[PDB]
């Protein structure tokens, strides 16, 4: 399992453990469901770049204890 560091702006320690086979597609909606918000309302920023729905945990370079940010979009979902 790959445990990513999901530190919220409010200083919250969220441990999101994913796998290598899993698609980042479901990862995005799962986070939305966890926060109780519509899909595409939040944008994930990794090394400045935004995570796409067709992205994979294999590309870019994601490891254990990897720090990633997520902020609210302007679209509203």
């Amino acid at each position: 399992y790959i445990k990513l560091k999901v530190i919220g702006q409010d200083s919250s320690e969220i441990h999101f453990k994913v796998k290598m086979t899993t698609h980042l597609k479901k990862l995005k909606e799962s986070y939305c469901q966890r926060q109780g918000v519509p899909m595409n309302s939040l944008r994930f920023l990794f090394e400045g770049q935004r995570i796409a729905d067709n992205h994979t945990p294999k590309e870019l370079g994601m490891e254990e204890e990897d720090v990633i940010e997520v902020y609210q979009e302007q679209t509203g979902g």
Binding site: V18, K19, K26, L27, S30
Partner: peptide, 12 residues
């Protein structure tokens, strides 16, 4: 404090 643990299972 705040600790959140979520496990997701996704397969190709």
């Amino acid at each position: 404090d705040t600790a959140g643990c979520i496990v997701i299972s996704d397969s190709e």
